[PDB]
Structure formats: structure tokens, C-alpha cells
Amino acid sequence: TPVTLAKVIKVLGRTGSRGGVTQVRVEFLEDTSRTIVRNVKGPVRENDILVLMESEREARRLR
Amino acid sequence: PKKRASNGRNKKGRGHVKPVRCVNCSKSIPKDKAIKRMAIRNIVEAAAVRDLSEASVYPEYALPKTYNKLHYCVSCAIHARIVRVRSREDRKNRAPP
Amino acid sequence: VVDPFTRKEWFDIKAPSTFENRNVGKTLVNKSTGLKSASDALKGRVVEVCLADLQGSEDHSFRKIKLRVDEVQGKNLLTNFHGMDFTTDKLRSMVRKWQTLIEANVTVKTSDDYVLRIFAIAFTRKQANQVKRHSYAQSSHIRAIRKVISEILTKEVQGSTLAQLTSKLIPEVINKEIENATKDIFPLQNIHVRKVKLLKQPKFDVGALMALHGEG
Amino acid sequence: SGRGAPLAKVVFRDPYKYRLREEIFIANEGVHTGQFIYAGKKASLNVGNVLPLGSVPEGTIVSNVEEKPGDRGALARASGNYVIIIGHNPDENKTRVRLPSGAKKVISSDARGVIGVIAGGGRVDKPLLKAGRAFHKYRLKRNSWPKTRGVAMNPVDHPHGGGNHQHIGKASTISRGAVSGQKAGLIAARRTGLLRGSQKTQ
Amino acid sequence: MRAKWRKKRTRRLKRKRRKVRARSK
Amino acid sequence: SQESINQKLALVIKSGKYTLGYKSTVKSLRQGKSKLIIIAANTPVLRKSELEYYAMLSKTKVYYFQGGNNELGTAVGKLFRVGVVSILEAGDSDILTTLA
Amino acid sequence: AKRTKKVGITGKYGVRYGSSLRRQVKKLEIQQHARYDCSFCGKKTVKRGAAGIWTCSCCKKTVAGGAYTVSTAAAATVRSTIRRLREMVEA
Amino acid sequence: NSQVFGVARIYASFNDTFVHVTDLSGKETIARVTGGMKVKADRDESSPYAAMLAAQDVAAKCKEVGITAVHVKIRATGGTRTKTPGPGGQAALRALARSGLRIGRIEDVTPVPSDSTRKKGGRRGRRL
RNA sequence: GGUGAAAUUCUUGGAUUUAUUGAAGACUAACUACUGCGAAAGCAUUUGCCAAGGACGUUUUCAUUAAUCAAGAACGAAAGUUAGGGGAUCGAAGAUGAUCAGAUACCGUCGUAGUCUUAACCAUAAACUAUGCCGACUAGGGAUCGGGUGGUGUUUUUUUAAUGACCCACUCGGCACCUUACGAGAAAUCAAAGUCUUUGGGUUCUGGGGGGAGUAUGGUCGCAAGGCUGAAACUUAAAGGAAUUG
């Protein structure tokens, strides 16, 4: 399956209207030079890995 | 009364200036008026430039930019949060930040 | 329910010998059949290329050229000039505020019947000691600049043909020509012969073309 | 007589004999005595000269254009009318032109046509004001004027006919599958009424 | 209301009364 | 870059030696005197050709005015119309060494 | 002297036929009885006979044109379009 | 430089994204697809997920025929319209890159008028 | 395609998208703007012809000719009307999909007149600088357009020259502008609405509670729509400026 693992790089801010959503950058965890910024659901810090169904959508702000 | 001396924008000696059209709403709006900006951008997004140059032949040749002027309606300008009302004294600052 | 590309061919472009890169492209057509020769259509195609991609350089990564197909031979097809241009990116990069603009244009036939409209653009600038912020002009200056531009463009185009001008404008001789001609009045940054437009062609003349070509 | 569009009496040297072959070209809005008219494939594209259609470019106009090569002139023949060229396709040499009704017609490039538009101009903007000028007009053409109305004629004389009131009774639009004696009114009317607008073909 | 439409309404009324008056020539 | 033929014509009037109208022009051009003819635009090609022939026989110069005979008469300073003018002593102008 | 505020020539039609039509006629009647200017002799001796052809009564040359006026505006556009194409061709 | 080359016209309105891949000329198109071809949602017709998902199969086809390298021209609606593209443009572009098709000579050819005909809206404009 | 979301609509006749060629009519982008010109309305592609005009250089040209103005006359956006040509887009009317309690309205699609021009008419707009014209003075301030004064300057290169524009300042008619306010005006504001109760610089129009009513009435101009002029009866105790709290 084309599923990805990616470890956090840094926190970016809490977005969306109700602020449940947060922004996070991750490192691809096998291509360290390749990073990606995305949106998440819940409590997050650095140094945690995320299982990604896409590595391309390259999310951005949200309300 | 006169909320603004110019009433408007830089006519002051002209009588008539041809109009333009708000790129958002298409309203007619004189060029003296009609907020004017410039949308300078690289086409590429920073998130993509890595894959871009990796796939790019002509290695490190250049990267062009997008150059676009943008007239605006007043109402649109305000609803864009692009321009906004200002304190009375603050209304004469003819500079950006 | 066909897979057309399992009917199609591949034709190698071969451009003039006045350039450098001639392995310019490959393009496909449906196979020539009865009552239908793919060449009949391929004779009319037109292609667009960066002059950088042509001459190997990247210093011409902004101008560009149109090439019209003229002939075919043995899975390979010969082109010829069809027009020049100037890219929008560079155009608006050049075109900023606080510098008056000028544009002129003329139309003339070569020594040969290859009639061309040719445009010229110019901006004003300041000279190294200036403080005011707009740097504009007067209409006398503008009119005389337009005049000289037209005269020079005509003088260069008449005594020449397409190949002459192609070999001029790859090295770009003519903007420096205008610069040397115009250093009297005004610096005039961003002088550029930016666009030419074919208006007419003579009889096709396979021979001139295959004389131009025919190497490697 | 019976025409706008004045006539032009051209004389040509007969190629194959010492004589002249005087002709009747329609005047084409600029013509005048002492003038020369050129005819040919190799003729100048000025006004009055007559040329094939492959021999002239797109956008050009012409009058008196033939519908077939050698019918000595058919179309764009009345006053103020003209036909516009809009294309060539040398696959079968077919020119494509636009006709005063607003019609697209595809014909032979070797078809001929005289360059310009026909005189007379706005003959039809001025009102006649009255019966007498209509009378003289239709005198010089044909006995179609005056014109009585079926709603005043008798049922024996018209299908509209009938009595106790000037009226018809049934539709005034008459299916083209119909036949003689029934064909009084509108024929194949794809609609009817007051209309808009304002092009004919597209 | 609005002055432009008072004006339009009065113009309508002028037309109407003038028609009613020229009824009697 | 250019001087107006109209002013030059006024000059040739006020100073130079000359005459008007086809007949006098041909008289002068037959006596071989006139140095410059001016001819309008509207005039018959036949008369234009006749005058051109007389000029080429007299070794005389020609100008083809860029306008009609009414305007030529206007410019030579009248209120009727003239097709042609003849000049025997091109006067205080220098038309002879112009493009003419 | 003046003899008529407006109708002029339309007085031949008296009280008849409607004012709209008489005005629409007045226009064209002036146009056609107008002694126009000749492109050839330059004079003003050009008058209609036999609607569609106008004669210069001195140079004798006839010219074809509109019925009531010499040039139709569409005919002038035609001449322009034609010379444009003539140049683009010959050149 | 054993890459064989094509060109890619990308056209991003605020409603849809058009990918279009052809030879170095316009004719003999190679691939063409939209966001609507991948979703029948009607508002996501310009979704950049859709543009990505379209560029995927476009590059697939360009390879299956045998193209390797691309030049790219791009445009908005233009004329007398926005002049600005939607978000899907850039995502389809990056998806092309990620597909592996090598790239060069990026350029914008969106149409621009010298003050051409009137615009829609009627002096007072499409108010939401 | 189009939307906030959809729908109407177009699509094996292969739409949209792609390339080429063409035609038409309109519009003159960006560059390029407290900048331009102009009695006002107003005016952007180029060139040529036509006249015209302000401002200036100005030891030139004449001698009080002149300033505002009833009557009277010219010009006069757009829309609008009459008629020819034109008719691409845009688009009242109109026809249609949605929404909505309803929507003959906003949104969407098409579309007539018109939008363009020609020949006539009209003659008004927040036709607003809602602020006349000419002169004297009040601080500066710096920009800046057009015009007029110097640099043992800059660069343009040739051997410097030369013009040349730029700058440095010197300088005038400018569109105008910033802080202050001395004066004025509650106040907003006014390089001028300043020059005034210490009341008068030449000077023309309109203005006098609100409405009724820009109606009626007539007259007059107009193809008409309508305009200019223009009341009264009757009715009635009011509407705005700034700023404060909400």
C-alpha cells in the first residue's frame, strides 16, 4: 500500500473556526530533506509520527 | 458633510476620467478612485519548488513570475479585508506599513 | 475503443541551419492511408520554441520563436521561420511604473517578398544623479524617438531577408544598433525589438529551404 | 424599367474577330463613363472589374456573383445588395460566401463576380405616399397591384372568403404538403408573429 | 419615499391629466 | 524636415514670374520659358499626359499637387479653380533645388 | 420670402399623407435635387436623372450611386475595404 | 538528452482545471482531463485534489505513449474576466512534477486585452 | 459552462479545450500616475493636413480699448426620440432556472431597443470644487507640470569636443498639497469660506419656515418624452451640523 510515515518538524498554529484543527509540518521520515505542511485534528507536539494517506495535497489554511 | 476633502481620489483639475471595472464585481469605478494593487508572485509554491527543480531540465535556469494589476470596487475592497476603515485622524496616512 | 496512438507515427523536426539546436522536437500524426496522407496536414503545423532552447544558451530564456512546417522527408520534417515574440513574464518585469513608455511599429517587405510588421518598445530612465521619482518625458522626445525607430527598423529590414535577420537577432545586433544610434538623446532602458509578424509569403520555393538546410 | 440598379453597357473587343460584343453589366456603385472594366483571373481587384472568387481574398465583397461557372451572373444582382466572401477550401475549389438574406452558400471558386455593390441604394426607404406611384411602379413590372383581400372576397373566390364579418375562420398558415388553391396565407411558417432578432443564419 | 420616484409619479400624473383635459380639446 | 508647398507657392506667386490656366501654360511651355508646371490631381489624365510631354520636350519640371483645382486656385490666391500653373522665373523660393 | 417654417418642398403634398412621411420624404427630396460636386471637374453640376445615375452637366460624365444621394455610406465602406485588401494583396 | 518533449497547456478558471498535453505544437493532443473527470461534485470541479488526481493520469498517458519531458504554458480565463487562476492549477503542476515528467520553460500566456469589449455585470455588478 | 449550492443551457452532428487562417464591429489596457491638456460638458493607439490656444523669454507692437451682466446667442454627459448605415460584446423591456412565505428583484442563461456612426432634435445630472471673476497681503515647507538663469559638475567618447538630459541650486504661470493658525466659522472646516459689527475692493444670480408643488394656470420651445417660466388655496410645529454613551 502507498501509505507514508512522517514525523513532526514543528507546530505552526491553530486554525479553523472552532479551533479544533491545528497546522503541523512533518518530515517524511525516509526523505528528511522532503517536508510537508498539513492540517491535523487533535493534540500534537513535535517528535510524533503520522500515518499519511496522501503526501501531495499540501494543505493550507482553513476556516 | 464632507467626510473627505478629495471626496474621492486624485481628480482635482480634470472634470472626467474614464472608468474601469472591479475585477471582482465588475462595477464601474473611476480610475482616480478604484484601489490599484499589483499581484506579483512566483508561479511555483514553496512547497512544490523542491519537486519542481528535481524534475526540471535546464538546471537552475530561472524561475519567472506573474505580473498582474488589480483594480477594485470599494465595497469589494472592504469585504476583502484588503482595505478597511480607519480612525479619523489616521485617515491621512498615505503610506502602507 | 481504438488506442489511436497505435496508428500514429513520429516525425523529427529539423530547423534552419542558422540556429544551433535542430533536434528540436518529435511530433506524431495518424498514419497516412488511402485518400489521406498525414503529410498533407503535417505541412501546415506550427511550433513554438524558446530561443534559449534553440541556441543552447539561457540568456534568451525570454524571447521565443514560431516555426511553420514546410516540408517532410523520411520520417523527418523541415521547418522555417514563422514569427518572433516577447514573453509576458519578462515584458511586465520590464514594465514598471515611474518610467514613461514608447512603442512604435512599422511594416515593410524584404528584398524578397516576405512582408513583416515589426514592433519596437522603449522605456525612459534616469542618469545616476537624479532625485525625482517619475522620470517622464515630453511628446517632442516621444515623437522623435518613434521617428528614428521607424527609420532604423526600415533601413535594417529592407536590405535583408529572414535569414539575415534571424542571424542578426540571435546575437541581437539591432538593439545595440539602436543604442549606439540613440545615446545622444536619452539612455532609454529596456529597448527591445519585441515582436515581428509575417503578413505574407511568396511562392513556397522548396529550393531555397533545402539549400538552407541539408547538413548532418 | 422595372429595376433599381442601373445597367452598364460595356463594350469589349471580340478576341476572335474584328468586332465588339456589347454587354449589359449592372452598374456597381462607382462606375462612370470613359471607365475601363477588367475581367479575368489576372484582373486588378478594383471596383467594376470582374473576377473569380479564388482570385480575390476573404472578407472581400462582390455583386452579380454566379452560382455556377458561366451562368453569366445570378446573385447579388438587385440594388444595394452584395455578397461577402468568408472562406476558400481548394478541396474541390469551393468558395464560401454570405448572401444578402444572410445565407451561407458554397460554390465554385471559378465562379465569377463583379466587384462592389449595386447602385440604387436606399430606393426602399422613401415612402410611396400613395397609390399612384405604386401604380406606375407595378405598371412598369407586372400586374400584381392592386391587391384585394380574401376576407373581403367571396368563399367562392378565396378560402378566407366568408361572411357576416370580414374574417377567416381557420389558420392562416398552410402546410406545405398542401396544394394549389389552398395556398393562400402563410405556407411553412416555422413560427408566426412579431419577431426578434436579428440574424438569419448561424 | 424618494424624490426621483415622486418625480416619475408626477410625470405620469401630468400625462394622465393632460389626456383627460384634451378629451375636451 | 519639410517646408510646405503651399507657402512655397505663395512665395512663387508674390515673387516669381508665372501664369495660370492650361492655354497660357502651354504657350509658355512652347516658348520653352516656364521652368515649373504645377498640375492638380483631379484633372484629366489626358491633359496631364499632354503637359508631361510638353515638359519632357522642354526639359521642364512638374509638380503633382496633392489636391484639386479649387484648392490649387485657393492656394495661388484666388476664388476660382485652376488645374495648372506655369513658372518661368521661380521667384524668392528655392523650389528648383528642392525635391522638386 | 421664407414662406414656410419647415415643410419646404413637401408643400407640394399639402395637408396630406402624414407628417412623419412628409419629413422622411423631405430629407431624400433635398438630397436628390441637390446639385452635388463632381469628382472629375470638381464643379457643382452633378444632378440626378433616372434614379441611380447622376450626370455632370458640363463634363458629361455619369456616375452610378444611390438613388437619392450619390454615395451610400456602405459604398464608401466598400471602397475602403477594397483598397485595404488591394494593398494587402499587391504588396 | 534522450527525452522526447511535449507541451502542456494548463487552464484554471475558478470553476475547473484543464490539463492539456500535446506535442510541441497544439495538434495531436496526448492527454486532456479536468477535475470534473475525476469527481462529479460540481463545486470541487476546481479542487486541487482534483487537479492532482487528473495530472496523475495525464502523466501516466504521456508515458504510456512515450513522452518524457514537458514545457508548460498556463492561463486563467482571461479576456475580460478574473485574469487570476484557481488553486487547482498549481496542484496539477506539482502533480506533474511528482509524476516524474521532466519539466522546463515555464510560461504564462493568459490572454490580455488592449482595453477590449465591455464586461459583464452592468455598471453595478454581480453582488453576493 | 455557471454558482454561495444547483438548475436552466451546449455536447458522437465530438462540445469545452487545443492549433491555424479569417471577418466584423467596438474599445485603446499594462506601462501609466495628488501628472498631463483643456470655458464647461470633457479628452489615451500612430502619422499627416487643418486651423486654434494658454503660459513664457521678451529694453518689441497700440493707448483706457476693460470687469460682471437682464434681453438676447453658442457649446452642452448619458438616457431618449426621427430616419439611413452598423449591429462583436454589454444589455432596461422581455424570456427563462434557482431561492424565498411569496420575487414579474437581487444570482444565473439568452436577448430586442440602445450601446457605434451619419443628418436632425432635445437641453437636462450629485451638469459638485454642491465654493464666480481680477488684484494686495499672511509661514513656511518642500515636491511636481509648462516657460526663463549659472555649473573651471556627472555621465554619454574620440583626443577631449558637441549637444544632450539628469542633478545643484536661481527662477515664473500651475493642477495642487502638508503642519499650524494668526483671522474667520458652533462645528465639521477654511494657504483659503482668511482680509468683518472696527460692519462698504469693482461686480452678476438665486435664496427666505416646512409642505402643498416645481403641482395648477396660462405663455413659450419641442416630433414627442418634456423643459424654461411659474403660482394660490389648504395645512403644520418643524428638518439638518458636529460631537458624546450606548
UniProtKB/Swiss-Prot annotation, chain B:
Its GO biological process annotations read:
cytoplasmic translation; maturation of LSU-rRNA from tricistronic rRNA transcript (SSU-rRNA, 5.8S rRNA, LSU-rRNA); ribosomal subunit export from nucleus; ribosome assembly
* Record keywords, A-Z: Cytoplasm, Ribonucleoprotein, Ribosomal protein
Q: Name one GO cellular component term.
A: 90S preribosome
Q: Name one GO molecular function term.
A: structural constituent of ribosome
Q: Locate the region Disordered.
A: 1-19
What's the chief localization of this chain?
cytoplasm
Q: Which residues form the signal peptide?
A: none
Q: What residue ranges carry the coiled-coil annotation? A: none
Query: Which locations, inside or outside the cell, does it occupy?
Result: Cytoplasm
Q: What does this protein do?
A: Component of the ribosome, a large ribonucleoprotein complex responsible for the synthesis of proteins in the cell. The small ribosomal subunit (SSU) binds messenger RNAs (mRNAs) and translates the encoded message by selecting cognate aminoacyl-transfer RNA (tRNA) molecules. The large subunit (LSU) contains the ribosomal catalytic site termed the peptidyl transferase center (PTC), which catalyzes the formation of peptide bonds, thereby polymerizing the amino acids delivered by tRNAs into a polypeptide chain.
Also noted in the record is: Present with 16300 molecules/cell in log phase SD medium. There are 2 genes for eS26 in yeast.
As for family, the record states:
Belongs to the eukaryotic ribosomal protein eS26 family.
Task: Report the protein name in the record.
Answer: Small ribosomal subunit protein eS26A
User: Which part of the full protein does this chain span, and how long is the full protein?
Assistant: 2 to 98 of 119
From Swiss-Prot, chain D:
For this UniProt record, the keywords arranged alphabetically read as follows: Cytoplasm, Isopeptide bond, Phosphoprotein, Ribonucleoprotein, Ribosomal protein, RNA-binding, rRNA-binding, Ubl conjugation
Residue list for modification Phosphoserine: 1, 44, 108-109, 198
Q: Where does this protein chiefly localize?
A: cytoplasm
Q: Which domain of life is it from?
A: Eukaryota
A single GO CC term for this protein reads: cytosolic large ribosomal subunit
Cross-link position, Glycyl lysine isopeptide (Lys-Gly) (interchain with G-Cter in ubiquitin)?
A: 42, 68, 94
Q: What is the annotated localization of this protein? A: Cytoplasm
What GO molecular function annotation could you give as one example from this UniProt entry?
A: structural constituent of ribosome
Mind listing the GO biological process terms from this record? cytoplasmic translation; maintenance of translational fidelity; ribosomal large subunit biogenesis
Please give the function described in this protein's UniProt entry.
Answer: Component of the ribosome, a large ribonucleoprotein complex responsible for the synthesis of proteins in the cell. The small ribosomal subunit (SSU) binds messenger RNAs (mRNAs) and translates the encoded message by selecting cognate aminoacyl-transfer RNA (tRNA) molecules. The large subunit (LSU) contains the ribosomal catalytic site termed the peptidyl transferase center (PTC), which catalyzes the formation of peptide bonds, thereby polymerizing the amino acids delivered by tRNAs into a polypeptide chain.
Miscellaneous note, as given in the UniProt record, is: There are 2 genes for uL2 in yeast.
Family that this chain belongs to: Belongs to the universal ribosomal protein uL2 family.
This chain belongs to the protein called: Large ribosomal subunit protein uL2A
- Source organism per entry reads Saccharomyces cerevisiae (strain ATCC 204508 / S288c)
Curated annotation (Swiss-Prot), chain F:
* Range of residues in the leader sequence: none
Q: What does UniProt give as GO cellular component? A: cytoplasm; cytosol; cytosolic large ribosomal subunit
A Gene Ontology MF term for this entry?
A: RNA binding
Return the Pfam families for the record: Ribosomal_L7Ae
- Residue ranges that the Swiss-Prot or TrEMBL entry lists as coiled coil: none
Where would I find the Glycyl lysine isopeptide (Lys-Gly) (interchain with G-Cter in ubiquitin) crosslink on this chain?
17, 48, 78
The free-text function statement in the UniProt record for this protein reads: Component of the ribosome, a large ribonucleoprotein complex responsible for the synthesis of proteins in the cell. The small ribosomal subunit (SSU) binds messenger RNAs (mRNAs) and translates the encoded message by selecting cognate aminoacyl-transfer RNA (tRNA) molecules. The large subunit (LSU) contains the ribosomal catalytic site termed the peptidyl transferase center (PTC), which catalyzes the formation of peptide bonds, thereby polymerizing the amino acids delivered by tRNAs into a polypeptide chain.
The protein's name? Large ribosomal subunit protein eL30
Tell me the lineage of the source organism: Eukaryota, Fungi, Dikarya, Ascomycota, Saccharomycotina
Record gene name: RPL30
Swiss-Prot record, chain G:
Q: Which UniProt keywords apply?
A: Cytoplasm, Metal-binding, Phosphoprotein, Ribonucleoprotein, Ribosomal protein, Zinc, Zinc-finger
Q: Which GO terms describe its molecular function?
A: structural constituent of ribosome; zinc ion binding
GO BP annotations of the record are:
cytoplasmic translation
Taxonomic superkingdom: Eukaryota
In this chain, the C4-type zinc fingers fall at: 38-59
Keyword check for Transferase: no
Q: Which GO terms describe its cellular component?
A: cytosol; cytosolic large ribosomal subunit
On this chain, the residues bearing Phosphoserine are 39
Write down the Pfam families for this protein, in alphabetical order: Ribosomal_L37ae
Compartment list? Cytoplasm
InterPro entries named among the record's database cross-references: Ribosomal_eL37/eL43, Ribosomal_eL43, Ribosomal_protein_eL43, Ribosomal_zn-bd
Task: Give any extra note attached to this record.
Answer: Present with 44600 molecules/cell in log phase SD medium.
Which family would the database say this protein is a member of? Belongs to the eukaryotic ribosomal protein eL43 family.
Q: How does it assemble?
A: Component of the large ribosomal subunit (LSU). Mature yeast ribosomes consist of a small (40S) and a large (60S) subunit. The 40S small subunit contains 1 molecule of ribosomal RNA (18S rRNA) and 33 different proteins (encoded by 57 genes). The large 60S subunit contains 3 rRNA molecules (25S, 5.8S and 5S rRNA) and 46 different proteins (encoded by 81 genes).
Protein known as? Large ribosomal subunit protein eL43A
